[PDB]
Amino acid sequence: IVGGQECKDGECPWQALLINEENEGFCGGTILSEFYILTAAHCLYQAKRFKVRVGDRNTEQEEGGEAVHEVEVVIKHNRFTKETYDFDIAVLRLKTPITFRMNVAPACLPERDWAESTLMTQKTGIVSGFGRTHEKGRQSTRLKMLEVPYVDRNSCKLSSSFIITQNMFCAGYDTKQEDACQGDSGGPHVTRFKDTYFVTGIVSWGEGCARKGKYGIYTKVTAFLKWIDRSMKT
């Protein structure tokens, strides 16, 4: 996360971190339930074997809420295309259930029509992660969050050197130095409504991080609500 702020105690409880064999985060995820994690399909090619960590805000100190979970099943969208990152979505079933507690709680899945009419029309959403704090920097040891404005679909298409499919949306800023970045991929984009946070996107890709005239591109979770529900029944 470039810019933004630290997630304070209890503020980003749905954050999951995909960790490689060396216990290093390489992507984010969103806790959907005791058994399921939402992430980006493109993250599943970045490590041979990985686990999921939840309840963590500082990778340099034990805070008392951290839990590592092994993955039982990887459910990747079969229409995922590496060239375009179209259908950039995957669900992970964990071997053991996540025990909700301080800093560990799921984000809500919204209904499609309502989310599109009422959440995606809000001024902003919230992206979070342990990703880089600048384009060429290192990954954050602190979990960060960032309020990102929803960006007009046409303005986003105009700004992009790459196709924006029906399965993607844009968020962030034109020139302001705030955006998701390397390592935030797979992570939550949530939208707040009456103090309730609904997952609205998955950190997918960007032409660099926080670049002028460029926005963050996120998987449009609302286009995948039926798919997620099916993936969560097996």
Partner: protein
């Protein structure tokens, strides 16, 4: 602005227009309150709530 268009139809969460009237509902883990609008968590750590 009418029904769900007017301030989310007064619903805490999901708003639907069945017939020409607002119907409110809630995410999984919440039950619709007696007033048919508010969403009450069924158990601890309901989805979407920052902890504490």
């Amino acid at each position: 602005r009418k029904l769900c268009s007017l301030d989310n139809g007064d619903c805490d969460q999901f708003c639907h227009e069945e017939q020409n009237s607002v119907v409110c509902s809630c995410a999984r883990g919440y039950t619709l309150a007696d007033n048919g609008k508010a969403c009450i968590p069924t158990g601890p750590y309901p989805c979407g709530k920052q902890t504490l």
